[PDB]
Amino acid sequence: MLKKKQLTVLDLHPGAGKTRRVLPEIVREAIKKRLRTVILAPTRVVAAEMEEALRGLPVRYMTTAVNVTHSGTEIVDLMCHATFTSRLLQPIRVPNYNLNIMDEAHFTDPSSIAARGYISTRVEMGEAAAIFMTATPPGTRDAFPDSNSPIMDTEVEVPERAWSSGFDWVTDHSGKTVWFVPSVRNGNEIAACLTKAGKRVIQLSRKTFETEFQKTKNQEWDFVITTDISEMGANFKADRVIDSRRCLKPVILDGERVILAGPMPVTHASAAQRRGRIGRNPNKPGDEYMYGGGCAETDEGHAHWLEARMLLDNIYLQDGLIASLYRPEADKVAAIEGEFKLRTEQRKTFVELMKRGDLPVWLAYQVASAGITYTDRRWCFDGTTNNTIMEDSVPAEVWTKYGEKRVLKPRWMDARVCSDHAALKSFKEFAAGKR
Ligand SMILES: COCC(=O)Nc1nc(-c2ccccc2)cs1
Protein backbone atom coordinates (compact mmCIF):
# COMPACT_ATOMS: atom_id res chain seq x y z
CA MET A 1 0.00 0.00 0.00
CA LEU A 2 2.92 2.34 0.95
CA LYS A 3 4.54 2.94 -2.58
CA LYS A 4 4.26 6.60 -3.76
CA LYS A 5 1.57 7.53 -6.37
CA GLN A 6 -0.94 5.05 -4.72
CA LEU A 7 -4.37 5.68 -3.08
CA THR A 8 -5.71 2.49 -1.37
CA VAL A 9 -9.32 2.21 -0.14
CA LEU A 10 -9.33 -0.17 2.87
CA ASP A 11 -13.05 -1.13 2.72
CA LEU A 12 -13.19 -4.02 5.26
CA HIS A 13 -16.74 -4.28 6.80
CA PRO A 14 -17.61 -2.32 9.99
CA GLY A 15 -15.95 -4.02 13.00
CA ALA A 16 -13.36 -5.90 10.81
CA GLY A 17 -10.52 -4.21 12.86
CA LYS A 18 -9.37 -1.41 10.46
CA THR A 19 -8.73 0.98 13.42
CA ARG A 20 -7.36 -1.44 16.14
CA ARG A 21 -5.56 -4.17 14.09
CA VAL A 22 -4.70 -2.87 10.55
CA LEU A 23 -3.81 0.78 11.44
CA PRO A 24 -0.97 -0.17 13.92
CA GLU A 25 0.50 -2.56 11.26
CA ILE A 26 0.48 0.27 8.61
CA VAL A 27 2.09 2.71 11.12
CA ARG A 28 4.89 0.20 12.03
CA GLU A 29 5.64 -0.34 8.29
CA ALA A 30 5.58 3.45 7.65
CA ILE A 31 8.12 4.13 10.49
CA LYS A 32 10.36 1.23 9.15
CA LYS A 33 10.36 2.96 5.69
CA ARG A 34 10.92 6.49 7.20
CA LEU A 35 7.63 7.79 5.68
CA ARG A 36 6.52 11.16 7.18
CA THR A 37 2.92 10.05 7.94
CA VAL A 38 -0.31 11.79 8.98
CA ILE A 39 -3.24 9.91 10.59
CA LEU A 40 -6.59 11.76 10.36
CA ALA A 41 -9.27 10.97 13.01
CA PRO A 42 -12.83 12.27 12.34
CA THR A 43 -13.34 13.23 16.06
CA ARG A 44 -11.43 13.76 19.33
CA VAL A 45 -13.18 10.57 20.62
CA VAL A 46 -11.64 8.47 17.77
CA ALA A 47 -8.25 10.25 18.28
CA ALA A 48 -8.24 8.95 21.94
CA GLU A 49 -9.24 5.36 20.76
CA MET A 50 -6.38 5.50 18.23
CA GLU A 51 -3.88 6.48 21.00
CA GLU A 52 -4.95 3.25 22.81
CA ALA A 53 -4.47 1.13 19.59
CA LEU A 54 -1.11 2.83 18.79
CA ARG A 55 0.15 3.02 22.41
CA GLY A 56 3.94 2.37 22.46
CA LEU A 57 4.48 3.58 18.82
CA PRO A 58 6.22 6.96 18.26
CA VAL A 59 3.17 9.08 17.25
CA ARG A 60 2.86 12.90 17.74
CA TYR A 61 -0.74 13.62 18.93
CA MET A 62 -1.71 17.07 17.59
CA THR A 63 -4.94 17.12 19.70
CA THR A 64 -5.63 18.09 23.42
CA ALA A 65 -7.94 14.99 23.47
CA VAL A 66 -4.75 12.98 24.37
CA ASN A 67 -2.47 13.98 27.33
CA VAL A 68 0.94 12.59 26.09
CA THR A 69 4.53 13.96 26.47
CA HIS A 70 5.89 13.84 22.81
CA SER A 71 9.63 12.89 22.49
CA GLY A 72 10.25 15.22 19.48
CA THR A 73 11.45 12.13 17.46
CA GLU A 74 8.05 11.14 15.94
CA ILE A 75 7.68 11.15 12.11
CA VAL A 76 3.99 10.09 12.45
CA ASP A 77 1.46 12.85 13.26
CA LEU A 78 -2.16 12.29 14.35
CA MET A 79 -4.79 15.04 14.17
CA CYS A 80 -8.50 15.42 13.43
CA HIS A 81 -9.71 15.78 9.78
CA ALA A 82 -10.83 19.40 10.62
CA THR A 83 -7.38 20.28 12.12
CA PHE A 84 -5.59 19.10 8.94
CA THR A 85 -7.81 21.29 6.70
CA SER A 86 -7.58 24.21 9.22
CA ARG A 87 -3.75 24.09 9.24
CA LEU A 88 -3.68 23.94 5.40
CA LEU A 89 -5.84 27.14 5.24
CA GLN A 90 -3.77 29.00 7.89
CA PRO A 91 -0.35 30.68 7.35
CA ILE A 92 1.41 27.67 8.93
CA ARG A 93 3.65 25.05 7.19
CA VAL A 94 2.00 21.60 7.02
CA PRO A 95 4.68 18.96 6.26
CA ASN A 96 4.34 17.36 2.76
CA TYR A 97 3.38 13.93 4.28
CA ASN A 98 4.66 10.92 2.23
CA LEU A 99 1.77 8.76 3.57
CA ASN A 100 -1.74 10.18 4.34
CA ILE A 101 -4.04 7.89 6.37
CA MET A 102 -7.70 8.95 6.74
CA ASP A 103 -9.75 6.88 9.23
CA GLU A 104 -13.59 6.97 8.86
CA ALA A 105 -12.92 8.37 5.34
CA HIS A 106 -16.70 8.42 4.56
CA PHE A 107 -17.12 11.60 6.77
CA THR A 108 -19.13 14.18 4.72
CA ASP A 109 -18.34 17.33 6.79
CA PRO A 110 -16.84 20.00 4.47
CA SER A 111 -13.34 19.82 6.09
CA SER A 112 -13.23 16.00 5.57
CA ILE A 113 -14.31 16.25 1.89
CA ALA A 114 -11.65 19.05 1.44
CA ALA A 115 -8.93 16.88 3.14
CA ARG A 116 -9.76 13.95 0.76
CA GLY A 117 -9.57 16.33 -2.24
CA TYR A 118 -6.20 17.75 -1.20
CA ILE A 119 -4.73 14.26 -0.37
CA SER A 120 -6.08 12.55 -3.51
CA THR A 121 -4.73 15.47 -5.68
CA ARG A 122 -1.22 14.98 -4.13
CA VAL A 123 -1.45 11.21 -4.92
CA GLU A 124 -2.64 11.93 -8.55
CA MET A 125 0.39 14.33 -8.87
CA GLY A 126 2.68 11.38 -7.88
CA GLU A 127 3.81 13.27 -4.74
CA ALA A 128 2.38 10.97 -1.98
CA ALA A 129 0.57 7.75 -0.95
CA ALA A 130 -2.82 7.64 0.83
CA ILE A 131 -4.97 5.07 2.57
CA PHE A 132 -8.71 5.88 3.05
CA MET A 133 -10.14 3.54 5.72
CA THR A 134 -13.94 3.06 5.48
CA ALA A 135 -16.52 0.25 5.19
CA THR A 136 -18.56 2.68 2.95
CA PRO A 137 -16.50 4.55 0.30
CA PRO A 138 -18.26 7.25 -1.81
CA GLY A 139 -21.12 5.91 -4.02
CA THR A 140 -21.48 2.62 -2.06
CA ARG A 141 -24.95 1.18 -2.84
CA ASP A 142 -24.99 -1.53 -0.07
CA ALA A 143 -26.79 -0.45 3.16
CA PHE A 144 -26.42 -4.03 4.52
CA PRO A 145 -22.72 -5.00 4.55
CA ASP A 146 -21.15 -7.97 6.38
CA SER A 147 -20.84 -7.81 10.22
CA ASN A 148 -18.92 -9.73 12.94
CA SER A 149 -22.25 -11.46 13.93
CA PRO A 150 -25.63 -11.90 12.23
CA ILE A 151 -27.99 -8.88 12.42
CA MET A 152 -31.84 -9.05 12.45
CA ASP A 153 -32.82 -6.41 9.78
CA THR A 154 -36.50 -5.29 10.10
CA GLU A 155 -38.23 -2.57 8.05
CA VAL A 156 -40.67 -0.91 10.53
CA GLU A 157 -42.41 2.48 10.99
CA VAL A 158 -40.16 4.41 13.44
CA PRO A 159 -41.54 7.34 15.47
CA GLU A 160 -40.17 10.87 14.74
CA ARG A 161 -42.48 12.48 17.35
CA ALA A 162 -43.63 11.70 20.90
CA TRP A 163 -46.15 8.79 20.79
CA SER A 164 -48.86 7.46 23.21
CA SER A 165 -49.51 4.08 21.45
CA GLY A 166 -48.69 1.90 18.41
CA PHE A 167 -44.88 1.45 19.03
CA ASP A 168 -44.79 -0.99 22.01
CA TRP A 169 -41.68 -2.71 20.44
CA VAL A 170 -39.63 0.47 21.14
CA THR A 171 -40.14 0.50 24.95
CA ASP A 172 -40.78 -3.29 25.43
CA HIS A 173 -37.00 -3.95 24.85
CA SER A 174 -34.72 -4.74 27.86
CA GLY A 175 -31.32 -4.12 26.11
CA LYS A 176 -29.53 -0.94 24.98
CA THR A 177 -30.63 1.02 21.85
CA VAL A 178 -28.77 3.53 19.67
CA TRP A 179 -31.44 5.63 17.89
CA PHE A 180 -30.43 7.77 14.87
CA VAL A 181 -32.65 10.87 14.50
CA PRO A 182 -32.51 13.46 11.68
CA SER A 183 -31.91 16.51 13.92
CA VAL A 184 -31.14 17.67 17.46
CA ARG A 185 -34.71 19.09 17.81
CA ASN A 186 -36.32 15.75 16.72
CA GLY A 187 -34.03 13.90 19.21
CA ASN A 188 -35.10 16.27 22.07
CA GLU A 189 -38.79 15.31 21.51
CA ILE A 190 -38.08 11.51 21.29
CA ALA A 191 -35.71 11.77 24.29
CA ALA A 192 -38.44 13.57 26.41
CA CYS A 193 -41.03 10.89 25.41
CA LEU A 194 -38.62 8.02 26.42
CA THR A 195 -37.65 9.87 29.67
CA LYS A 196 -41.37 10.24 30.60
CA ALA A 197 -41.74 6.42 29.96
CA GLY A 198 -38.98 5.78 32.60
CA LYS A 199 -36.04 5.29 30.19
CA ARG A 200 -32.48 6.57 30.77
CA VAL A 201 -31.52 8.62 27.70
CA ILE A 202 -28.22 10.19 26.54
CA GLN A 203 -28.34 12.65 23.57
CA LEU A 204 -25.34 13.08 21.20
CA SER A 205 -24.80 15.77 18.53
CA ARG A 206 -21.73 17.45 16.94
CA LYS A 207 -21.61 20.24 19.62
CA THR A 208 -22.08 17.88 22.64
CA PHE A 209 -20.25 14.79 21.24
CA GLU A 210 -17.00 14.61 23.31
CA THR A 211 -18.65 15.54 26.67
CA GLU A 212 -21.82 13.42 26.29
CA PHE A 213 -20.15 10.34 24.65
CA GLN A 214 -18.26 9.76 27.99
CA LYS A 215 -21.68 9.20 29.70
CA THR A 216 -22.19 6.07 27.49
CA LYS A 217 -19.13 4.56 29.28
CA ASN A 218 -19.57 6.03 32.84
CA GLN A 219 -23.31 5.40 33.53
CA GLU A 220 -26.02 2.81 32.75
CA TRP A 221 -28.34 3.97 29.92
CA ASP A 222 -31.30 2.47 27.96
CA PHE A 223 -31.19 4.75 24.84
CA VAL A 224 -28.62 6.86 23.04
CA ILE A 225 -30.41 9.45 20.84
CA THR A 226 -27.91 10.61 18.24
CA THR A 227 -27.63 12.59 14.99
CA ASP A 228 -25.50 11.30 12.06
CA ILE A 229 -22.23 12.20 13.98
CA SER A 230 -22.30 8.65 15.52
CA GLU A 231 -21.70 7.25 11.96
CA MET A 232 -18.02 8.28 12.40
CA GLY A 233 -16.57 5.34 14.38
CA ALA A 234 -18.53 5.90 17.69
CA ASN A 235 -18.75 2.47 19.44
CA PHE A 236 -21.48 1.46 21.88
CA LYS A 237 -22.17 -1.73 23.91
CA ALA A 238 -25.67 -2.01 22.39
CA ASP A 239 -27.93 -4.80 21.03
CA ARG A 240 -30.28 -2.62 18.90
CA VAL A 241 -30.15 0.25 16.41
CA ILE A 242 -33.37 2.14 15.63
CA ASP A 243 -32.75 4.09 12.42
CA SER A 244 -35.19 6.81 11.17
CA ARG A 245 -33.16 6.50 7.91
CA ARG A 246 -33.60 10.32 7.72
CA CYS A 247 -31.23 13.33 7.81
CA LEU A 248 -31.31 17.10 7.12
CA LYS A 249 -29.65 18.33 3.91
CA PRO A 250 -28.20 21.86 3.73
CA VAL A 251 -29.17 23.30 0.32
CA ILE A 252 -28.07 26.62 -1.18
CA LEU A 253 -31.17 28.27 -2.86
CA ASP A 254 -30.51 30.73 -5.75
CA GLY A 255 -26.85 31.27 -4.56
CA GLU A 256 -28.29 33.52 -1.74
CA ARG A 257 -29.49 31.50 1.35
CA VAL A 258 -29.03 28.08 2.93
CA ILE A 259 -32.02 26.03 4.14
CA LEU A 260 -32.07 22.72 6.02
CA ALA A 261 -34.21 20.60 3.64
CA GLY A 262 -35.95 17.41 4.80
CA PRO A 263 -35.84 15.39 6.82
CA MET A 264 -35.11 13.13 3.85
CA PRO A 265 -33.55 9.71 3.19
CA VAL A 266 -29.95 8.99 4.24
CA THR A 267 -27.35 7.63 1.75
CA HIS A 268 -26.57 3.87 1.55
CA ALA A 269 -23.19 4.71 3.23
CA SER A 270 -24.92 6.44 6.19
CA ALA A 271 -27.48 3.58 6.58
CA ALA A 272 -24.62 0.98 6.57
CA GLN A 273 -22.64 3.01 9.25
CA ARG A 274 -25.77 3.40 11.44
CA ARG A 275 -26.51 -0.32 11.16
CA GLY A 276 -22.76 -0.99 11.66
CA ARG A 277 -23.02 0.24 15.29
CA ILE A 278 -24.37 -3.30 16.14
CA GLY A 279 -23.52 -6.89 15.06
CA ARG A 280 -19.94 -6.09 16.17
CA ASN A 281 -19.60 -8.97 18.75
CA PRO A 282 -19.15 -12.46 17.17
CA ASN A 283 -20.26 -13.93 20.58
CA LYS A 284 -23.58 -11.96 20.53
CA PRO A 285 -25.61 -12.82 17.40
CA GLY A 286 -29.08 -11.33 16.76
CA ASP A 287 -28.44 -7.68 17.39
CA GLU A 288 -31.47 -5.88 15.85
CA TYR A 289 -31.56 -3.14 13.15
CA MET A 290 -34.99 -1.49 12.88
CA TYR A 291 -35.14 0.91 9.92
CA GLY A 292 -37.94 3.38 9.09
CA GLY A 293 -37.34 4.28 5.41
CA GLY A 294 -35.36 3.67 2.22
CA CYS A 295 -31.97 5.16 1.17
CA ALA A 296 -31.40 7.73 -1.60
CA GLU A 297 -28.27 9.56 -2.84
CA THR A 298 -29.15 12.81 -0.92
CA ASP A 299 -25.41 13.85 -1.03
CA GLU A 300 -26.09 15.07 -4.63
CA GLY A 301 -26.52 18.91 -4.46
CA HIS A 302 -25.76 18.87 -0.68
CA ALA A 303 -24.07 22.18 0.39
CA HIS A 304 -21.12 20.35 2.10
CA TRP A 305 -19.61 19.54 -1.36
CA LEU A 306 -19.82 23.21 -2.50
CA GLU A 307 -18.39 24.27 0.93
CA ALA A 308 -15.48 21.74 0.36
CA ARG A 309 -14.77 23.53 -3.00
CA MET A 310 -14.74 26.90 -1.13
CA LEU A 311 -12.10 25.50 1.30
CA LEU A 312 -9.98 23.87 -1.50
CA ASP A 313 -10.08 27.06 -3.63
CA ASN A 314 -8.31 28.79 -0.68
CA ILE A 315 -5.58 26.14 -0.02
CA TYR A 316 -2.15 26.63 -1.61
CA LEU A 317 -1.07 23.55 -3.64
CA GLN A 318 1.51 24.78 -6.23
CA ASP A 319 1.48 28.21 -8.04
CA GLY A 320 -2.18 28.72 -9.10
CA LEU A 321 -3.08 24.96 -9.19
CA ILE A 322 -6.16 24.03 -7.09
CA ALA A 323 -6.93 20.60 -5.58
CA SER A 324 -9.87 18.67 -7.12
CA LEU A 325 -12.43 16.76 -5.03
CA TYR A 326 -11.65 13.04 -4.67
CA ARG A 327 -12.91 11.63 -8.02
CA PRO A 328 -15.79 9.38 -6.71
CA GLU A 329 -17.39 12.38 -4.94
CA ALA A 330 -16.48 15.10 -7.51
CA ASP A 331 -19.94 15.14 -9.30
CA LYS A 332 -21.90 15.86 -6.06
CA VAL A 333 -21.54 19.61 -6.87
CA ALA A 334 -21.67 21.78 -10.04
CA ALA A 335 -18.63 23.97 -9.22
CA ILE A 336 -15.62 25.30 -11.15
CA GLU A 337 -12.17 24.80 -9.47
CA GLY A 338 -10.96 28.33 -8.48
CA GLU A 339 -14.40 30.10 -8.58
CA PHE A 340 -14.15 30.74 -4.75
CA LYS A 341 -10.44 31.74 -4.65
CA LEU A 342 -10.16 34.87 -2.43
CA ARG A 343 -7.47 37.61 -2.39
CA THR A 344 -5.10 37.52 0.64
CA GLU A 345 -7.06 39.82 3.07
CA GLN A 346 -10.53 38.41 2.17
CA ARG A 347 -9.07 34.83 2.56
CA LYS A 348 -7.79 35.70 6.06
CA THR A 349 -11.30 37.07 6.95
CA PHE A 350 -12.87 33.84 5.56
CA VAL A 351 -10.57 31.65 7.70
CA GLU A 352 -11.18 33.73 10.88
CA LEU A 353 -15.02 33.73 10.40
CA MET A 354 -14.79 29.91 10.42
CA LYS A 355 -12.03 29.37 13.06
CA ARG A 356 -13.04 32.08 15.64
CA GLY A 357 -16.50 33.01 14.29
CA ASP A 358 -17.61 29.32 14.13
CA LEU A 359 -19.77 30.28 11.09
CA PRO A 360 -20.67 27.69 8.45
CA VAL A 361 -18.25 27.73 5.46
CA TRP A 362 -20.90 29.11 3.05
CA LEU A 363 -21.84 32.03 5.37
CA ALA A 364 -18.12 32.81 6.16
CA TYR A 365 -17.56 32.96 2.37
CA GLN A 366 -20.46 35.40 1.71
CA VAL A 367 -19.22 37.80 4.42
CA ALA A 368 -15.49 37.60 3.42
CA SER A 369 -16.24 37.87 -0.38
CA ALA A 370 -18.38 41.01 0.29
CA GLY A 371 -15.16 42.70 1.67
CA ILE A 372 -16.54 42.81 5.29
CA THR A 373 -13.83 42.57 8.02
CA TYR A 374 -14.05 39.94 10.81
CA THR A 375 -15.26 42.30 13.66
CA ASP A 376 -17.80 44.20 11.45
CA ARG A 377 -21.23 42.73 12.44
CA ARG A 378 -23.51 45.33 10.76
CA TRP A 379 -24.48 42.57 8.24
CA CYS A 380 -26.17 40.57 11.09
CA PHE A 381 -28.86 43.32 11.29
CA ASP A 382 -29.42 44.78 7.73
CA GLY A 383 -31.04 41.82 5.89
CA THR A 384 -34.62 41.87 4.47
CA THR A 385 -37.57 41.31 6.88
CA ASN A 386 -37.87 37.68 5.60
CA ASN A 387 -34.28 36.96 6.94
CA THR A 388 -35.56 37.75 10.50
CA ILE A 389 -34.38 34.96 12.87
CA MET A 390 -37.24 33.72 15.06
CA GLU A 391 -36.78 32.53 18.71
CA ASP A 392 -39.95 30.75 20.09
CA SER A 393 -42.20 32.45 17.45
CA VAL A 394 -40.85 36.04 18.21
CA PRO A 395 -37.98 37.86 16.37
CA ALA A 396 -34.62 37.09 18.13
CA GLU A 397 -33.07 40.25 19.65
CA VAL A 398 -29.51 41.12 20.74
CA TRP A 399 -27.70 44.12 22.13
CA THR A 400 -25.21 45.23 19.48
CA LYS A 401 -21.59 46.08 20.36
CA TYR A 402 -22.90 49.71 20.23
CA GLY A 403 -25.38 49.08 23.11
CA GLU A 404 -28.49 49.15 20.80
CA LYS A 405 -31.24 46.41 21.00
CA ARG A 406 -31.81 45.11 17.46
CA VAL A 407 -33.66 42.34 15.67
CA LEU A 408 -31.35 39.64 14.33
CA LYS A 409 -31.82 39.92 10.55
CA PRO A 410 -28.71 38.71 8.70
CA ARG A 411 -27.97 39.94 5.16
CA TRP A 412 -27.32 36.23 4.27
CA MET A 413 -29.55 33.63 5.95
CA ASP A 414 -27.94 30.21 6.70
CA ALA A 415 -30.45 28.00 8.62
CA ARG A 416 -27.51 26.27 10.37
CA VAL A 417 -26.89 29.38 12.56
CA CYS A 418 -30.36 28.81 14.19
CA SER A 419 -30.99 24.99 13.70
CA ASP A 420 -31.34 24.55 17.52
CA HIS A 421 -31.20 26.65 20.72
CA ALA A 422 -27.36 26.16 21.09
CA ALA A 423 -26.69 27.30 17.46
CA LEU A 424 -28.91 30.42 17.83
CA LYS A 425 -27.29 31.28 21.21
CA SER A 426 -23.80 31.09 19.55
CA PHE A 427 -24.94 33.21 16.59
CA LYS A 428 -26.51 35.87 18.94
CA GLU A 429 -23.12 36.09 20.78
CA PHE A 430 -21.44 36.51 17.37
CA ALA A 431 -23.92 39.22 16.25
CA ALA A 432 -23.33 41.03 19.62
CA GLY A 433 -19.52 41.15 18.95
CA LYS A 434 -18.77 38.69 21.80
CA ARG A 435 -16.16 36.78 19.71
C1 LIG B 1 -36.77 6.47 0.08
O1 LIG B 1 -37.09 6.22 -1.26
C2 LIG B 1 -37.93 7.19 -1.83
C3 LIG B 1 -37.09 8.46 -1.85
O2 LIG B 1 -35.96 8.44 -2.32
N1 LIG B 1 -37.71 9.58 -1.21
C4 LIG B 1 -37.13 10.85 -1.12
N2 LIG B 1 -37.69 11.89 -0.51
C5 LIG B 1 -36.83 13.03 -0.65
C6 LIG B 1 -37.19 14.25 0.02
C7 LIG B 1 -37.79 14.19 1.31
C8 LIG B 1 -38.05 15.38 1.99
C9 LIG B 1 -37.73 16.63 1.42
C10 LIG B 1 -37.15 16.68 0.14
C11 LIG B 1 -36.88 15.50 -0.56
C12 LIG B 1 -35.67 12.82 -1.37
S1 LIG B 1 -35.53 11.19 -1.91
Side-chain angles (χ1 to χ4, degrees), residues 1-2 4 6-435:
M1 313 183 197
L2 268 47
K4 200 162 292 189
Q6 187 139 89
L7 197 151
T8 301
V9 176
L10 182 63
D11 68 341
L12 304 180
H13 72 71
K18 289 185 305 296
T19 299
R20 294 191 83 75
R21 184 186 71 262
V22 184
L23 179 60
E25 282 179 352
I26 293 169
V27 170
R28 271 193 209 92
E29 192 172 322
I31 293 166
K32 180 179 174 54
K33 300 189 187 170
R34 289 317 213 290
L35 299 178
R36 194 72 167 91
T37 299
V38 65
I39 306 168
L40 301 181
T43 71
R44 281 162 63 91
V45 164
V46 165
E49 292 171 349
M50 283 176 168
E51 184 276 333
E52 197 174 300
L54 296 167
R55 189 167 301 165
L57 294 179
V59 173
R60 180 179 199 198
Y61 292 89
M62 288 169 68
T63 170
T64 47
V66 168
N67 190 23
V68 309
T69 299
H70 300 120
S71 74
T73 67
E74 300 93 344
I75 64 167
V76 179
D77 294 337
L78 189 145
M79 66 185 80
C80 285
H81 301 187
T83 306
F84 180 75
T85 300
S86 180
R87 290 177 83 86
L88 289 173
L89 282 157
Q90 293 178 254
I92 156 190
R93 184 169 25 262
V94 172
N96 279 319
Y97 296 100
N98 307 121
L99 178 61
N100 302 267
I101 307 169
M102 185 181 271
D103 199 3
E104 309 297 350
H106 57 276
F107 196 10
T108 61
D109 283 9
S111 61
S112 296
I113 300 162
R116 289 193 291 283
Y118 181 88
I119 293 163
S120 61
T121 296
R122 292 195 55 239
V123 171
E124 186 192 346
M125 281 170 165
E127 289 297 330
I131 303 164
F132 291 176
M133 297 194 290
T134 180
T136 60
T140 187
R141 289 180 183 174
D142 188 12
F144 295 102
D146 291 351
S147 44
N148 290 339
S149 63
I151 295 161
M152 325 297 287
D153 291 312
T154 305
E155 187 185 76
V156 62
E157 187 79 23
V158 170
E160 300 192 25
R161 300 287 187 282
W163 66 96
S164 311
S165 75
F167 300 95
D168 288 359
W169 64 266
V170 172
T171 47
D172 277 351
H173 194 256
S174 56
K176 304 216 292 198
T177 300
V178 176
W179 187 328
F180 288 88
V181 296
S183 68
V184 170
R185 283 182 165 164
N186 276 172
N188 292 339
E189 176 161 356
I190 291 157
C193 178
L194 295 168
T195 297
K196 166 163 176 186
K199 301 303 190 180
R200 292 161 297 171
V201 184
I202 292 168
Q203 292 178 250
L204 308 175
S205 67
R206 278 174 180 68
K207 285 296 295 166
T208 64
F209 197 70
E210 204 189 17
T211 308
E212 294 306 283
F213 182 78
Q214 183 60 23
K215 293 195 192 154
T216 67
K217 296 204 306 294
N218 183 61
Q219 52 189 81
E220 283 147 17
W221 52 269
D222 302 312
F223 288 77
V224 163
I225 297 331
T226 180
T227 71
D228 72 313
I229 190 55
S230 288
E231 292 170 23
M232 256 61 59
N235 290 303
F236 305 97
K237 177 210 303 305
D239 68 342
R240 179 169 71 163
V241 167
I242 292 177
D243 189 358
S244 56
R245 286 275 193 98
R246 305 234 284 181
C247 59
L248 291 181
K249 186 191 174 168
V251 184
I252 300 151
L253 305 186
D254 302 330
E256 99 188 350
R257 59 217 303 103
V258 170
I259 63 149
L260 287 167
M264 67 178 62
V266 296
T267 59
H268 292 80
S270 285
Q273 291 291 351
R274 292 177 174 202
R275 179 175 176 267
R277 293 319 87 199
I278 53 61
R280 299 183 77 86
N281 185 348
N283 293 135
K284 281 226 168 54
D287 286 353
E288 295 179 335
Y289 177 71
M290 268 77 181
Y291 61 100
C295 299
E297 286 310 301
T298 55
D299 282 354
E300 308 282 327
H302 184 304
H304 285 182
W305 280 266
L306 193 289
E307 295 179 299
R309 282 257 42 99
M310 291 172 161
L311 296 179
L312 281 177
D313 278 354
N314 287 286
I315 292 168
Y316 182 78
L317 183 63
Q318 176 174 305
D319 298 323
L321 298 179
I322 296 189
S324 294
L325 295 177
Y326 175 46
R327 172 56 264 201
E329 63 188 326
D331 289 330
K332 293 184 170 148
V333 55
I336 299 129
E337 303 171 358
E339 77 180 293
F340 304 119
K341 178 170 189 179
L342 293 167
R343 279 293 314 115
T344 300
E345 289 318 306
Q346 292 188 354
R347 176 176 306 180
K348 296 190 232 250
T349 303
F350 170 57
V351 170
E352 192 171 18
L353 284 165
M354 291 182 293
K355 186 172 232 318
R356 196 186 310 279
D358 201 30
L359 301 190
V361 181
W362 177 93
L363 188 60
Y365 182 85
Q366 305 314 124
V367 174
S369 61
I372 296 164
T373 59
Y374 171 76
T375 55
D376 185 354
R377 302 299 156 78
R378 289 179 291 180
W379 70 270
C380 297
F381 303 104
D382 66 10
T384 48
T385 199
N386 75 308
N387 283 4
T388 302
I389 292 169
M390 298 301 292
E391 190 181 331
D392 303 317
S393 319
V394 69
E397 277 171 18
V398 298
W399 287 269
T400 73
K401 73 192 215 178
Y402 293 100
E404 209 206 334
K405 205 75 180 300
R406 292 191 78 188
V407 169
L408 196 54
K409 202 168 39 160
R411 204 185 300 172
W412 305 277
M413 181 60 227
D414 185 324
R416 290 165 297 179
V417 306
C418 54
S419 73
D420 63 38
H421 174 72
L424 170 58
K425 183 179 189 299
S426 175
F427 189 60
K428 287 162 79 178
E429 283 161 3
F430 181 90
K434 294 201 198 240
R435 64 175 189 278

